Symmetry: D2
């Protein structure tokens, strides 16, 4: 009976062996390739699309996509472990990857035609083609609209804060159309009326490239609309999948913060003694450990529930709210101990925590589910 400060509940022992190598894969990749890049990349907001090629080579894009389509046919827990390990380096990297996996690949696999699945998935899976997701507009009821035309759609609108957009080959875009239903459309790079100007001067997620998608009478052929989804269900299946992945990821960022802070305090001294000798510092460390340890249990359990089909979408709201909130708290706690990879993790998480608005959308999904009553 031996104590592991860094893994108190021996998560290692709760993973399948299959799951444990996915994790180490993602780990070796993130540490070997992303850690040496991240500092200058964050600092200068530098576009590097190498992550796609690289991650695609080792089978980490579209983790839940079947082998039939070039995916690695893994389960949800593996998806989670992958995101955890990448965010352990940087939220911006994780972000790029959850765009490929949850925001582009998943809607094509789930909602697309045979022909669409065959054309896009395999190249997405290898990261030869990079994808982006256009739902968000400038300040789920969009004005971006598709109208029917000769064979057969024309899109006009704007989508703001689209990660990958300026380098994307493939575009999953959501617009209204009637016979008013929200629909998903597949556009490709270099297409008439489609542009994607980059955004610079970000405070957080500076290691990912972000842009808009500007659609000025952009022509989508009939064969490019997602056949098997209409309405909220489409965007929502995508966000639900991504929020799951962000819930594991945020914990990775938090672990980094905890380790850096722990190591900092071991190594530096005050009044002839390490900071670690300090009770206040020990309390803070105790809380980081605790919140992270519990969070991991929550996401592990949600992942198992997804895999066996026993998980309602509302669970994802618990884990995503919690994971981001506590990761943010932990980063701030770690920051106020130092006298700086932590500062990076901190502004990242500041963006990540408020991404889905400022009125705590998940607290409400959950309030409504407990009470029956909408806020």
């Amino acid at each position: 009976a031996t104590f592991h400060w860094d893994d108190p509940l021996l998560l290692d022992q709760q993973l399948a062996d299959d799951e444990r190598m996915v994790r180490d894969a993602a780990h070796a990749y993130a540490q070997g390739k992303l850690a040496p890049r991240v500092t200058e990349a964050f600092r200068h907001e530098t576009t590097d699309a190498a992550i796609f090629r690289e991650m695609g080579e080792i089978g980490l894009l579209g983790p839940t996509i079947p082998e039939q389509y070039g995916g690695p046919g893994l389960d949800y827990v593996s998806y989670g472990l992958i995101a955890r390990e990448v965010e352990r380096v940087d939220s911006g990297y994780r972000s790029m990857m959850s765009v490929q996996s949850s925001l582009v690949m998943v809607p094509i696999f789930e909602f697309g035609s045979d022909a669409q699945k065959e054309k896009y998935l395999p190249k997405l899976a290898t990261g030869e083609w990079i994808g982006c997701f256009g739902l968000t507009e400038p300040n789920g009821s969009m004005v971006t609209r598709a109208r029917k035309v000769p064979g057969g759609y024309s899109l006009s609108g704007s989508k703001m804060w689209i990660t990958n957009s300026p380098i994307a080959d493939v575009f999953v875009v959501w617009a209204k159309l009637d016979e008013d239903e929200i629909r998903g459309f597949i556009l490709e790079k270099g297409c008439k009326g489609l542009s994607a100007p980059a955004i610079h001067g970000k405070v957080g997620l500076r290691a990912s490239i972000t842009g808009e998608i500007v659609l000025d009478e952009a022509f989508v052929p009939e064969e490019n609309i997602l056949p098997h989804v209409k309405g909220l269900r489409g965007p929502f299946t995508c966000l639900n999948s991504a929020r799951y992945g962000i819930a594991w990821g945020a914990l990775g960022a938090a672990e980094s913060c905890w380790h850096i802070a722990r190591q900092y305090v071991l190594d530096r001294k005050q009044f002839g003694r390490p900071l670690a000798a300090n009770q206040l510092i020990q309390k803070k460390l105790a809380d980081m450990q605790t919140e992270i340890t519990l969070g991991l249990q929550g996401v592990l359990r949600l992942g198992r529930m997804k895999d066996e089909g026993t998980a309602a979408v509302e669970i994802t709201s618990i884990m995503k709210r919690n994971s981001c909130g506590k990761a943010l708290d932990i980063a701030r706690l770690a920051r106020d101990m130092l006298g700086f990879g932590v500062a990076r993790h901190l502004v990242n998480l500041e963006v990540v925590n408020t991404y889905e608005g400022t009125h705590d959308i998940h607290a409400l999904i959950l309030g409504r589910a407990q009470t029956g009553i909408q806020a």
Copy 2:
């Protein structure tokens, strides 16, 4: 796949049918026998000794103690489940039970002689014998209750304070320093009701845990036969092994109390109206219920996992610190959150919360666990 707001992670489906049965049985007893008693018992600080035989005859005392000695020989997860169903009603009753199991029966089963084990456990198991634990003094290693050697055994003088069960106890597990082979070490002694120089006056007018009887143990040259000393333990390890067992039970029990305050809070916001709309429609009210659900759900995954690890023998003692500190701290936050949601002033049943609140303020004092964790993380002691 259906959402279960009251069990989001389907804890119910993470259990063996085995443990599920023990849970339901604990629940039926708590709700059928302890719920009716609780309001008056708490308001009037009433002594109900009859509770131990009730708990005992259905195998709630000494969950983990083997059948050889009258226990049900259940695993740690079952013990947890039992603690949680009882505290769901009141921390004071849980206190009664956690003392019997972890602080009386455990040191005996674990440290005592074969004669001691057969003498004491079976009666402690059925509840015929009420036990208690004498460790806290008026003002751990700096203990002052003294055992000195005499013909026929030992003679103990000293005082213990805040000992739950003592005024109604038949059996007393008492920790005292015995200087021997030179060496001054902590030893355990079993005493019995009626023994000369042992008195257990009761303490009344408690602020919390009023449904549970507490008093003192006053040792005045009380005679303990040489066959009433715990043969197999010396020093900190004795008292510690017991508290560690108790903290595990408390880590589960506290979550039951938090579930009640949550459940009460939720019902209250449904039934109340404000500005025509029910209280449930307010955004701030929904944050608070979300926070409550979150912390409870996660705290449960925490104690379940620790349970599995103890049954596997893979759990280190430090893990208990995290779970006890988290369960008690988060349950005390939830009680304060639910208490602040009620307007008015204690007439209503939904001021069951006020009782849970004050209980949880005692339990949270029975920071040190942060220090255990900080030390484990760093290798430097800061106590």
Copy 3:
């Protein structure tokens, strides 16, 4: 220059000497007469009416009421200092005195006829007559005055009225019809005249040391000469509340000082690992937070008091101080309760704690003061 840990900003020296003697008189009275009573009174929810004569005797009832009506003619700073000294012992008691001064004497003084003033204030000032105040029910109030022969008939029920079961004088706010138009008017009523009931409330979780009841109006008759003539609508009730709130703001800070002091003496006295608890860094941060919040909270009510004496204080300022004093007293009592072991004398803290939980939730659980303040900042009613 020395440091007074118990009064870092030397509030003692920001007071005028007359103000200090007012403070010491309340402190002598509270430590003398209330301190010995409090545990049992709380423990057993007693009625103690004798406190009103006691406070009236030495002129602490309705401090700002002029001598011309039996008041001591003090300012708002002394009102505060008194409320602070009483609550230092117990919130329940401060409340009794709050009701008498802000919720009965003030309305009569600002809104009553000369006759009303001479009939009621002197007796309230001595404590001969005890008062209460009915506003809150189980703008959109439903308690009602019918105009009838010779005056009014009042019907409805007010709840949670401290002093009500032992009150001699009642100030009720009911709505009255005026040629179609409905407006809030204040009425004085006396004990025992037919139609009025004062049934106590029992088994309270906090403020147990203060007797509390309903007011029950079933067609209770009020004469014409008993309607408050010089106010209608919001001004009446609000002028009262805005005065009680000011005293509660000073009071809460008195309760918080008790918790602080008790906590500090408790950790100096208790030993763990052969050193006082006061030696731990986690303990010292908590004590620093208590010292800070109280010191700042005090500078705020002082400035409020002085602005009130100068007629420069806007009504919204009171919302700042009330919310802050109470909210921060609750935190401090919680921080102090969490530093103590044992399970009930240092346990004045448990008492303060449960008092401050009622006080902090008394005006609702929607944080009415944040809204007042948010509306004043942004212009927007939430």
Copy 4:
């Protein structure tokens, strides 16, 4: 009924003497006029500018408590605070540059220096013609940096790290052990043995320049040792003065974050209303206004006390901890009210990172206050 000022609930403005109010407006006109337009690029590219010293010197805002006699503007502590607050309202880096001159340079020359040193350094420090720095921190401790007697003065050897102003400073106030007490010395730029290497890539306080003071047998003349101080009393008096200014400044930053958050929820709509209409936003706004209003009274009261000589050193711990900690809370609260990522409102992201650093120079104040309350020391 009197008028409510949401932005000055307790009418701080009214509590101020005539001259005090005038200084406030002076520093405000300067900060809004000269510093505001520079701050976004200065912070972004960590773009050193130093014309500020000479700018603030010219309107008499450097070394506020130094008497007119020595070229100072001869003002009280409240005025010092108000200045710090108007500058920090714009950026903590700028206040920091100004805190070093006033508190960490001109104060010790005035308190502990000879008539000669007072006549020579202060008039040019006051106008911002000479720029000062303060070398105390080492990579006290106790400090290692040592001074040694040599013909007609002292030879100094050692190192100071994280010295703000150092790579641009004309005058150095350095603390060394002399055999064995700590003393302060006035070094001049161009002294042999004095190197001041710059440091780049900070997270916060990016508007200010920081560097080292590497000393290698540096020669100080006899007439450049502070004759009137020995031991901790020297450094501590400087720090204690700087903390007082930091106490006001941090509330200036807290004010900006508050006003920015406020204006932001006015401007943005959600669900058909301004965000300012949400109950929870109102609570946050209330907290911001409460903590700022109360902190302002505390530092004002501390100002009056320091003026009248009744303020113990510990009160400064109270205010500095309160001001920095509450400022940071407020900047975190504002930051969290903002969606988006990188326009005007993200002036908040700047103030937050500044306050993160400012807050992190010294909890140590929690323990100063714990010991004064309990008689027991818990630093080590």
